[PDB]
Amino acid sequence: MQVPHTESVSLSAGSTVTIKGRPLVCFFNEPHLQVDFHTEMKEDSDIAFHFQVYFGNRVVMNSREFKIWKEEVESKNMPFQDGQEFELSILVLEDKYQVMVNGQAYYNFNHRIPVSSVKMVQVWRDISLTKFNVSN
Amino acid sequence: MQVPHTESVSLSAGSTVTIKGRPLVCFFNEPHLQVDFHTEMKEDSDIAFHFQVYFGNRVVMNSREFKIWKEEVESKNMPFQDGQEFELSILVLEDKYQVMVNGQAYYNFNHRIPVSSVKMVQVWRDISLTKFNVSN
């Protein structure tokens, strides 16, 4: 599976985006993971949901609307384990995205852009990928 | 050329480390480049010279000594061009590392660890690589 990974999607309440992968280096060297829900296939399109894991440290979430980054949302929750494969499950709810790590919800991000605007997901930074699945 | 790229090295005053590559995404999405001069082959070994480019934004330099990150050094110099292949040339001088971008020096980092302690270089984050050459 190629990284950066870019896929066309369509999402609504009830959708899940499942991502399975492995960080490329040890947590001590601070690998990152970034998942961006874009409004168009173009890479510089707006981002309804930006989810960036600083492995072993913190998580940052935001949106990019009309080319401008908005209010940052940080989390200290860090369920990811050094050297381990992770399974990310991003649930689309009516009010928010909910990010599950290995089956439990650890991050939440209220919708700022309607989820019907999402047309693309890009997964990138310091991971290998074995699975990217949108429910249907 | 595989990324993350890890090579055994030996460096002294007069050495140059040349790195040619290309960012994996457009500058608007803030790709990174990280070059770490390590004291051992192990990834979690100390770092005599940590050089991290936030493409289109800034550069951060530091050292990691006895597993602890030291004083950060930032630069606003940004000679890198969006979408373009870059040629990084890291000159080892008696007093410092000097980072050249496409033939001109834009960053400098005084030695905190003796350069004879460097045994490994790792190049990683959001780039493809076509060249990694240590002068000899």
CSV table of N, CA and C in Angstrom, one decimal, chain B residues 8-86:
chain,number,residue,atom,x,y,z
B,8,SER,N,25.8,3.9,7.8
B,8,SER,CA,27.0,4.1,8.5
B,8,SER,C,27.9,5.1,7.9
B,9,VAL,N,28.5,6.0,8.7
B,9,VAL,CA,29.4,7.0,8.2
B,9,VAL,C,30.5,7.2,9.1
B,10,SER,N,31.6,7.9,8.6
B,10,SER,CA,32.6,8.5,9.4
B,10,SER,C,32.9,9.9,8.9
B,11,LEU,N,33.0,10.9,9.7
B,11,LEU,CA,33.1,12.2,9.3
B,11,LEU,C,34.2,13.0,10.0
B,12,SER,N,34.8,13.9,9.3
B,12,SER,CA,35.8,14.8,9.8
B,12,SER,C,35.7,16.1,9.1
B,13,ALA,N,36.5,17.1,9.6
B,13,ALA,CA,36.5,18.4,9.0
B,13,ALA,C,37.0,18.2,7.5
B,14,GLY,N,36.2,18.8,6.6
B,14,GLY,CA,36.4,18.6,5.2
B,14,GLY,C,35.4,17.6,4.5
B,15,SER,N,34.7,16.7,5.3
B,15,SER,CA,33.7,15.9,4.8
B,15,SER,C,32.5,16.7,4.3
B,16,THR,N,31.8,16.1,3.3
B,16,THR,CA,30.5,16.6,2.9
B,16,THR,C,29.5,15.4,2.8
B,17,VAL,N,28.3,15.7,3.2
B,17,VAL,CA,27.2,14.7,3.1
B,17,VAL,C,26.2,15.4,2.1
B,18,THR,N,26.0,14.7,1.0
B,18,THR,CA,25.2,15.3,-0.1
B,18,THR,C,23.9,14.4,-0.2
B,19,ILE,N,22.8,15.1,-0.2
B,19,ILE,CA,21.5,14.5,-0.2
B,19,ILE,C,20.6,15.1,-1.3
B,20,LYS,N,20.2,14.3,-2.2
B,20,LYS,CA,19.3,14.8,-3.3
B,20,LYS,C,17.9,14.0,-3.2
B,21,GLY,N,16.9,14.8,-3.2
B,21,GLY,CA,15.6,14.2,-3.0
B,21,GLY,C,14.5,15.2,-3.4
B,22,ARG,N,13.2,14.8,-3.1
B,22,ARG,CA,12.1,15.6,-3.5
B,22,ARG,C,11.0,15.4,-2.5
B,23,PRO,N,10.4,16.5,-2.0
B,23,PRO,CA,9.3,16.4,-1.1
B,23,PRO,C,8.1,15.6,-1.7
B,24,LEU,N,7.4,14.8,-0.9
B,24,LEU,CA,6.4,13.9,-1.4
B,24,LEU,C,5.1,14.6,-1.6
B,25,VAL,N,4.8,15.7,-1.1
B,25,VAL,CA,3.5,16.5,-1.3
B,25,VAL,C,3.9,18.0,-1.5
B,26,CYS,N,2.9,18.7,-1.9
B,26,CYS,CA,3.1,20.2,-2.1
B,26,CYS,C,3.4,20.9,-0.8
B,27,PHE,N,4.1,22.0,-0.9
B,27,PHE,CA,4.5,22.7,0.3
B,27,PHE,C,3.3,23.2,1.1
B,28,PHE,N,2.2,23.4,0.5
B,28,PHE,CA,1.0,23.9,1.2
B,28,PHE,C,0.6,23.0,2.3
B,29,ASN,N,0.9,21.7,2.1
B,29,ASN,CA,0.5,20.7,3.2
B,29,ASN,C,1.7,20.4,4.1
B,30,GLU,N,2.7,21.2,4.1
B,30,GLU,CA,3.8,21.2,5.1
B,30,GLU,C,4.5,19.9,5.2
B,31,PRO,N,5.1,19.4,4.1
B,31,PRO,CA,5.9,18.2,4.3
B,31,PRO,C,7.2,18.6,5.1
B,32,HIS,N,7.8,17.5,5.7
B,32,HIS,CA,9.0,17.7,6.5
B,32,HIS,C,10.2,16.9,5.8
B,33,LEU,N,11.4,17.3,6.2
B,33,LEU,CA,12.6,16.6,6.0
B,33,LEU,C,13.4,16.5,7.3
B,34,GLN,N,13.9,15.4,7.7
B,34,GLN,CA,14.7,15.3,8.8
B,34,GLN,C,16.0,14.6,8.5
B,35,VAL,N,17.1,15.2,8.9
B,35,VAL,CA,18.4,14.6,8.8
B,35,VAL,C,19.1,14.5,10.2
B,36,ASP,N,19.4,13.3,10.6
B,36,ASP,CA,20.0,13.1,12.0
B,36,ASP,C,21.3,12.5,11.9
B,37,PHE,N,22.4,13.1,12.4
B,37,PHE,CA,23.7,12.6,12.6
B,37,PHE,C,23.8,11.9,13.9
B,38,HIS,N,23.8,10.6,14.0
B,38,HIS,CA,23.8,9.8,15.2
B,38,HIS,C,25.2,9.3,15.6
B,39,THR,N,25.3,9.0,16.9
B,39,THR,CA,26.6,8.5,17.4
B,39,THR,C,26.7,7.0,17.3
B,40,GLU,N,25.6,6.3,17.1
B,40,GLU,CA,25.7,4.9,16.9
B,40,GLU,C,24.7,4.5,15.8
B,41,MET,N,24.8,3.2,15.3
B,41,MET,CA,23.9,2.7,14.3
B,41,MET,C,22.4,2.6,14.9
B,42,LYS,N,22.3,2.4,16.2
B,42,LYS,CA,21.0,2.3,16.8
B,42,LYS,C,20.2,3.6,16.6
B,43,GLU,N,18.9,3.4,16.3
B,43,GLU,CA,18.1,4.6,16.0
B,43,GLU,C,17.9,5.5,17.1
B,44,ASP,N,17.9,5.0,18.4
B,44,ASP,CA,17.7,5.8,19.5
B,44,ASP,C,19.0,6.3,20.1
B,45,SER,N,20.1,6.2,19.4
B,45,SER,CA,21.4,6.7,19.9
B,45,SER,C,21.3,8.3,19.8
B,46,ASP,N,22.3,8.9,20.5
B,46,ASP,CA,22.4,10.3,20.6
B,46,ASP,C,22.6,10.9,19.2
B,47,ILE,N,22.2,12.2,19.1
B,47,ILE,CA,22.2,12.9,17.8
B,47,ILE,C,23.1,14.1,17.9
B,48,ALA,N,24.2,14.1,17.2
B,48,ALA,CA,25.1,15.3,17.2
B,48,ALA,C,24.5,16.4,16.4
B,49,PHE,N,23.7,16.1,15.4
B,49,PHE,CA,23.2,17.2,14.6
B,49,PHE,C,21.8,16.7,14.0
B,50,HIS,N,20.8,17.4,14.5
B,50,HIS,CA,19.4,17.1,14.1
B,50,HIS,C,19.0,18.3,13.2
B,51,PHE,N,18.5,18.1,12.0
B,51,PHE,CA,18.2,19.1,11.0
B,51,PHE,C,16.9,18.8,10.4
B,52,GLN,N,15.9,19.6,10.7
B,52,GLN,CA,14.5,19.3,10.3
B,52,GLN,C,14.0,20.5,9.6
B,53,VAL,N,13.6,20.3,8.3
B,53,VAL,CA,13.0,21.3,7.5
B,53,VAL,C,11.5,21.1,7.5
B,54,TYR,N,10.8,22.2,7.9
B,54,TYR,CA,9.4,22.3,7.7
B,54,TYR,C,9.2,23.1,6.4
B,55,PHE,N,9.1,22.4,5.3
B,55,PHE,CA,9.2,23.0,4.0
B,55,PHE,C,8.2,24.1,3.8
B,56,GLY,N,8.6,25.2,3.3
B,56,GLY,CA,7.8,26.4,3.1
B,56,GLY,C,7.6,27.2,4.4
B,57,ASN,N,8.3,26.8,5.5
B,57,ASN,CA,8.0,27.5,6.8
B,57,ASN,C,9.3,27.8,7.5
B,58,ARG,N,10.0,26.9,8.0
B,58,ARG,CA,11.2,27.2,8.9
B,58,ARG,C,12.0,25.9,9.0
B,59,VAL,N,13.2,26.1,9.6
B,59,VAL,CA,14.1,25.0,9.9
B,59,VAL,C,14.4,25.0,11.4
B,60,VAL,N,14.5,23.8,12.0
B,60,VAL,CA,14.8,23.6,13.4
B,60,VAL,C,16.1,22.7,13.4
B,61,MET,N,17.0,23.1,14.3
B,61,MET,CA,18.2,22.3,14.5
B,61,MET,C,18.4,22.1,16.0
B,62,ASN,N,19.0,21.0,16.4
B,62,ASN,CA,19.2,20.6,17.8
B,62,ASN,C,20.2,19.5,17.9
B,63,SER,N,20.5,19.1,19.1
B,63,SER,CA,21.2,17.9,19.4
B,63,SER,C,20.5,17.1,20.5
B,64,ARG,N,20.7,15.8,20.5
B,64,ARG,CA,20.1,14.9,21.5
B,64,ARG,C,21.3,14.2,22.2
B,65,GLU,N,21.6,14.6,23.5
B,65,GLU,CA,22.8,14.2,24.2
B,65,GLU,C,22.3,13.4,25.4
B,66,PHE,N,22.8,12.2,25.6
B,66,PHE,CA,22.4,11.3,26.7
B,66,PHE,C,20.9,11.2,26.8
B,67,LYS,N,20.3,11.0,25.6
B,67,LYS,CA,18.9,10.8,25.4
B,67,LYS,C,18.0,12.1,25.7
B,68,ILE,N,18.6,13.3,25.8
B,68,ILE,CA,17.9,14.5,26.1
B,68,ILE,C,18.1,15.5,25.0
B,69,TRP,N,17.0,16.0,24.5
B,69,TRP,CA,17.0,17.1,23.5
B,69,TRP,C,17.6,18.4,24.2
B,70,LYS,N,18.5,19.1,23.5
B,70,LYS,CA,19.1,20.3,24.0
B,70,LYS,C,18.5,21.6,23.5
B,71,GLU,N,19.3,22.6,23.3
B,71,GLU,CA,18.7,23.9,23.0
B,71,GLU,C,18.4,24.0,21.5
B,72,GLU,N,17.2,24.3,21.2
B,72,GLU,CA,16.7,24.4,19.8
B,72,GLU,C,17.3,25.6,19.2
B,73,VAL,N,17.6,25.5,17.9
B,73,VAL,CA,18.1,26.6,17.0
B,73,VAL,C,17.2,26.7,15.8
B,74,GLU,N,16.5,27.8,15.6
B,74,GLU,CA,15.5,27.9,14.5
B,74,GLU,C,16.1,28.9,13.4
B,75,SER,N,15.7,28.6,12.2
B,75,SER,CA,16.0,29.5,11.1
B,75,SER,C,14.7,29.7,10.2
B,76,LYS,N,14.5,31.0,9.8
B,76,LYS,CA,13.5,31.3,8.9
B,76,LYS,C,13.9,31.2,7.4
B,77,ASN,N,15.2,31.0,7.2
B,77,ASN,CA,15.7,30.8,5.8
B,77,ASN,C,15.0,29.6,5.2
B,78,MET,N,14.5,29.8,3.9
B,78,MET,CA,13.7,28.8,3.2
B,78,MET,C,14.0,28.9,1.8
B,79,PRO,N,15.2,28.4,1.3
B,79,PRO,CA,15.6,28.5,-0.1
B,79,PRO,C,14.9,27.4,-0.9
B,80,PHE,N,14.2,26.4,-0.2
B,80,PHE,CA,13.6,25.3,-0.9
B,80,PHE,C,12.4,25.8,-1.7
B,81,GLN,N,12.2,25.2,-2.9
B,81,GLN,CA,11.2,25.6,-3.8
B,81,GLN,C,10.1,24.5,-3.9
B,82,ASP,N,8.8,24.9,-3.9
B,82,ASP,CA,7.7,24.0,-3.9
B,82,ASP,C,7.8,23.1,-5.2
B,83,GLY,N,7.6,21.8,-4.9
B,83,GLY,CA,7.6,20.8,-6.0
B,83,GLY,C,8.9,20.4,-6.6
B,84,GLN,N,10.0,21.1,-6.2
B,84,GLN,CA,11.3,20.9,-6.8
B,84,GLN,C,12.2,19.9,-6.1
B,85,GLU,N,13.0,19.2,-6.9
B,85,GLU,CA,14.1,18.5,-6.3
B,85,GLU,C,15.1,19.4,-5.7
B,86,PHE,N,15.6,19.0,-4.5
B,86,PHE,CA,16.6,19.8,-3.8
B,86,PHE,C,17.9,19.0,-3.7
